[PDB]
C-alpha cells in the first residue's frame, strides 16, 4: 500500500498519456539515465526544456528529482527565513502540490484541465484497477479526486529509495567503507571551512542524519540572465524572474531574486547549472563565487564566454554577508572542490562522470 502507492506513481511517471499530444512524460524531462534531468537539446542547448507541443521552451533549467523528497514543506522559520517547498522559487508547498503542475502547464505537458487528465487515466484498464484499489471506486470519474490521487502517487514514488539511494562515494566514505583521495579530501576540507558550508549543508551546526548539501533556504547569488534561454522562453527582454517573490502570497520585496539552494548531490552529472542553466561547466559554477572575493581581472570574466559574468538579473537582496568571504579560491582549491563534488554522485551515475 505504501509499496502499491509508489508502484502506481512509477507507472504514471513514465506515461506520456498525461501529455496533450501524448509525446511527453515526467521521465522525458526528468530522465533516469541522466539523474532525473533533461538530456535533450533545444534552442538554448540544455539550459531549458521543450514542452509537449515541440516548440515551447521553459525559462528555468529542469532540476533533478533525486533527493527532492528530503526537502521540508515550505515554511517561514523563526529567523524570518523562508525554507523548503518545491520549484526553484518554492511556489509549490511539497511534492504532492508540485506534481499536478507540469501536467496542466501549457509550456510543458499542456493538458487543458483536470477532466482531460481524468479522461486519459480512465482510458487505461490498469489505472482503473490500481487507482480504485488505493483510493476507492469512482475515483477516476471525479476529475478533482483523480488529479489529486495521481499527484499523491507521483509524490509517493519520488519518496522511494530509487530517487534517494545515499550510495555515493561520499556516503561510503562516511560509513567507513572507503577513503577519499588526497584531492577529494582537500576538496571536502575546503567545502566545510569556506563559505559553501553556509548554504550547502543541511544544518547550521551538528551532524545531519541524511545530508543533501542544501539548507533549503532562498538566496540571491546575483546571477545574470541566460539570454539564449530567455529568448527561447519568449517571456520578453523586459521580463524579470523574481524567484521566491513570484510565489503567490509572498509580498516582501526583500525576497526578489532569491532561489532555493539546490542539493549538490549528483551535481557533476546534471549540468548546465543554476536556475537558468547559464553555466555549462561545473568548474565555471564554482568560479562564479570568486567574483565576490577575488581582485584579479580574471575573476570578473566568465571563462566560457571570455566576457564579464554580467549584471545580476536582480541587483538587490544579494547574500553579500555570505558571498563576500574575503578569500579567493585559487586553482588548486577549485580543482579540489570539483573532485569533492564528484564524490556526491550516486553509484549508478558514476559511469556518467567520464563524459
Amino acid at each position: 500500500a505504501d509499496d502499491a502507492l509508489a508502484a502506481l506513481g512509477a507507472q504514471l511517471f513514465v506515461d506520456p498519456a498525461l501529455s496533450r499530444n501524448a509525446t511527453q512524460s515526467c521521465a522525458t524531462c526528468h530522465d533516469p539515465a541522466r539523474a532525473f534531468t533533461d538530456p535533450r537539446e533545444g534552442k538554448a542547448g540544455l539550459a531549458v526544456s521543450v514542452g509537449d507541443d515541440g516548440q515551447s521552451h521553459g525559462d528555468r533549467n529542469t532540476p533533478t528529482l533525486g533527493y527532492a523528497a528530503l526537502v521540508p514543506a515550505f515554511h517561514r522559520d523563526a529567523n524570518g527565513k523562508y525554507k523548503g517547498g518545491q520549484f526553484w522559487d518554492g511556489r509549490a508547498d511539497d511534492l504532492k502540490q508540485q506534481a499536478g503542475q507540469p501536467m496542466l502547464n501549457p509550456v510543458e505537458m499542456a493538458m487543458p484541465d483536470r477532466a482531460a487528465v481524468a479522461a486519459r487515466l480512465r482510458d487505461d484498464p490498469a489505472y482503473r484497477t490500481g487507482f480504485e484499489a488505493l483510493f476507492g471506486k469512482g475515483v477516476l470519474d471525479d476529475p478533482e479526486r483523480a488529479f489529486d490521487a495521481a499527484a499523491e502517487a507521483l509524490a509517493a514514488y519520488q519518496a522511494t529509495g530509487e530517487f534517494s539511494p545515499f550510495d555515493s562515494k561520499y556516503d561510503r566514505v562516511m560509513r567507513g567503507e572507503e577513503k577519499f583521495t588526497p584531492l577529494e579530501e582537500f576538496g571536502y576540507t575546503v567545502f566545510i571551512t569556506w563559505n559553501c558550508r553556509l548554504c550547502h549543508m543541511q544544518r547550521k551546526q551538528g551532524v545531519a542524519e541524511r545530508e543533501t548539501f542544501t539548507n533549503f533556504e532562498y538566496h540571491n547569488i546575483g546571477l545574470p540572465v541566460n539570454e539564449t534561454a530567455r529568448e527561447a522562453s519568449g517571456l520578453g527582454a523586459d521580463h524579470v524572474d523574481h524567484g521566491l517573490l513570484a510565489r503567490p502570497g509572498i509580498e516582501d520585496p526583500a525576497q526578489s531574486g532569491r532561489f532555493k539552494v539546490p542539493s549538490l548531490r549528483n551535481v557533476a552529472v546534471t549540468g548546465p547549472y543554476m536556475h537558468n542553466g547559464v553555466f555549462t561547466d561545473l568548474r565555471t559554477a564554482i568560479l562564479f563565487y570568486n567574483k565576490y572575493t577575488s581582485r584579479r581581472p580574471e575573476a570578473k570574466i566568465n571563462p566560457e564566454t571570455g566576457a564579464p559574468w554580467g549584471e545580476p538579473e536582480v541587483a538587490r537582496n544579494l547574500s553579500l554577508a555570505e558571498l563576500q568571504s574575503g578569500l579567493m579560491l585559487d586553482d588548486g582549491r577549485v580543482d579540489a572542490l570539483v573532485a569533492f563534488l564528484e564524490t556526491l554522485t550516486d553509484r549508478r551515475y558514476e559511469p556518467l562522470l567520464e563524459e
Binding site: 562516511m174 571551512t193 558550508r197
Partner: protein, 125 residues
C-alpha cells in the same frame, strides 16, 4: 598541567582548556566573555572563515569536525586563554592552521581577534 603531556579531552566543562571541542583552539573561549560555546559576545562580529580539526568526543566515542570561527572587532578578551593543537598543521596547510586570525567575512570588515567559538560541522573523515 604537564603541558607536554598528551591532551586528554573531557565533556563536563566548556570553560576549561581540556574541553573536547577546544582541541585546536588558539586564543580565548568565547563563553567567558559573554558569548556561548557556539555564539559570539554582544558587540563583536562573527567571521565566516574557519579552521578545522577532528576532535574526539569522550561522551560518545566519536570524532567530530570542529570548524572554529572567530568573534572579531574587539581587543582580545584575556579570559580563559587556551592554545591546543591536535592535528594542527603549519601555515602552508591553512585549513588546519590555528595561528592565523580567521576573521575573514566578519561584518564591518572587523579583523581584530577577541575570542573563538567551537561549533560542530560534521563527523570525521
Amino acid at each position: 598541567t604537564d603541558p607536554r603531556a598528551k591532551w586528554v579531552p573531557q565533556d563536563n566543562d566548556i570553560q576549561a582548556c581540556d574541553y573536547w571541542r577546544h582541541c585546536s583552539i588558539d586564543g580565548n573561549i568565547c563563553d567567558c566573555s559573554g558569548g556561548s560555546l557556539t555564539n559570539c559576545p554582544p558587540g563583536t562580529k562573527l567571521a565566516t572563515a574557519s579552521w578545522v580539526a577532528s576532535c574526539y568526543n569522550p561522551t560518545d566515542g566519536q570524532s567530530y569536525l570542529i570548524a572554529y570561527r572567530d568573534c572579531c572587532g574587539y581587543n582580545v578578551s584575556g579570559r580563559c586563554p587556551c592554545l591546543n593543537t591536535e592535528g594542527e598543521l603549519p601555515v602552508y596547510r591553512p585549513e588546519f592552521a590555528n595561528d592565523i586570525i580567521w576573521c575573514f567575512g566578519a561584518e564591518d570588515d572587523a579583523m581584530t581577534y577577541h575570542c573563538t567559538i567551537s561549533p560542530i560541522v560534521g563527523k570525521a573523515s
